[PDB]
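User: Can you fold this complex?
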Amino acid sequence: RPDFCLEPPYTGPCKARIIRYFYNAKAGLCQTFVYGGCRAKRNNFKSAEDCMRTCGGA
Amino acid sequence: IVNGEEAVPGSWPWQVSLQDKTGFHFCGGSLINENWVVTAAHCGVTTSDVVVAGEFDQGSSSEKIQKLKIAKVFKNSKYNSLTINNDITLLKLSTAASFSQTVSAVCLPSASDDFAAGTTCVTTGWGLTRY
Amino acid sequence: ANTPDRLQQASLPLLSNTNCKKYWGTKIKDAMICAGASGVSSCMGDSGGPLVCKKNGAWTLVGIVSWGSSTCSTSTPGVYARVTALVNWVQQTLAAN
Amino acid sequence: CGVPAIQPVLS
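Assistant: Here's the predicted assembly.
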């Protein structure tokens, strides 16, 4: 339900290769993605469960 | 590194690779002596990650490198998550690095050292080549 | 992909804070140092790495790869943690453990 | 410190 759940994954200006999850509303599920290590947005979990419990079915 | 050139094996001996359990590389680091690694704060290193010294070719069934364990992590207390200021961390090694010919430490500057603009420096890593 | 298997490197010019600010403006804090926009750029996977400069024949840690163009833009200055500034802490931290 | 066994090249 939250609506940040509908935003596309945000990498950030930092330069790391960090694997994260983000809910993909088109698909209907959380998927993995690479995060830069800073300035994270809300649709960005450390785990699919989290990602699923929070944006689930959004 | 975008637009870089492939380096000569063992020429940047201080350079390590921080990886996860599965062996996934997510950040670089530098050796400052046999027990300490200097890296970025936002890399989010943790005691369960690994330091890997000795490499050059990450795609090698097996080479002659060292996998060290993280004794302890120290993010600098002043690191600003929002501004990105003071982005530094020290990793203390569980097991010291055996310095070799491919494994050395880098020199640390002095607080008053002055580095002139226009000077040529170098940077190395295993980061994307293309965006 | 674009994830080199083999270590890479590049040579780049340090920028002065002033000329850095001509691009990133106030975003440039104190423990930061800029370099690049010369045709290369640090990129994903590079953070925590090193920026070395020759001091009296030796390789010195001038900065640590931090952040920059969200796209690894080569006409754009990259920013790193400025070691000089972070140094003491390092020393002290070392010294106490 | 800062003196590699193997000299780097170009860079």
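The two ends of chain D are 18 Å apart (CA to CA). Chain D touches chain B through eleven residues (CB under 8 Å).
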